[PDB]
Design a protein around this ligand. Structure first.
Ligand SMILES: CCCCCCCCCCCCCC(=O)O
Length: 195
């Protein structure tokens, strides 16, 4: 799973409804990757991946590679759902990056809600920012998939989830992107980051 003992990702989807899913994670082993590889895809300012990874802790950091589905106005949303056994309040920071420069930072809060003997954190139908909406509209008009991938080699997302009250990092996911054919549909591969 994408998860620690303290906080587990349960579901993540980005979508349009007039429901089409661009990406979708629903929730053994897990493979690994050297963070060293992907430092250049994120800022080296504060909120840089190298910095975050230093006294991390290490086991909190994951990489997701998405093969997205661009084959569909509208409502553009992002729904995520986490869970834990501790009652917490979460700060969720999403940083969109283009050529290793941060161009968007979205910061949200969610308090634990009791359900079926555990705590769930529901950040549902958060409206996708306008930068991504326009970017997606442009991207889908490209005539070849290899062009879309070329454009996407420069585009990344860094998602940091901290315990609001203690300021401890619970989860840090790096996201990288290509597109899929409609035939194959959306896919992802969750790795762990090591050093
Ligand atoms: C090919 C890219 C597909 C787009 C998928 C969006 C990925 C997650 C969005 C990042 C977090 C929220 C951003 C926002 O609400 O502005």
């Amino acid at each position: 799973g994408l998860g620690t003992a303290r906080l587990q990702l349960v579901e993540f989807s980005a979508f349009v409804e007039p429901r089409h899913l661009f990406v979708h994670i629903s929730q053994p082993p897990l493979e690994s990757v050297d963070v060293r590889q992907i430092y250049d895809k994120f800022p080296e300012k504060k909120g840089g991946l190298r910095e975050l990874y230093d006294r991390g802790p290490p086991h909190a950091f994951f990489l997701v590679k998405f093969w997205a589905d661009l084959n569909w106005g509208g409502f553009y949303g992002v729904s995520s759902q986490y869970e834990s056994l501790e009652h917490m309040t979460l700060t969720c920071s999403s940083k969109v990056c283009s050529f290793g420069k941060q161009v968007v930072e979205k910061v949200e809060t969610e308090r634990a809600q009791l359900e079926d003997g555990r705590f769930v954190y529901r950040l549902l139908r958060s409206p996708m920012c306008e930068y991504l909406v326009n970017f997606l509209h442009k991207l889908r008009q490209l005539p070849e998939r290899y062009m879309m991938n070329s454009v996407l080699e420069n585009f990344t997302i860094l998602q940091v989830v901290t315990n609001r009250d203690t300021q401890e990092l619970l989860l840090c996911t790096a996201y990288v992107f290509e597109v899929s054919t409609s035939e194959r549909g959306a896919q992802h591969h969750i790795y762990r980051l090591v050093r």
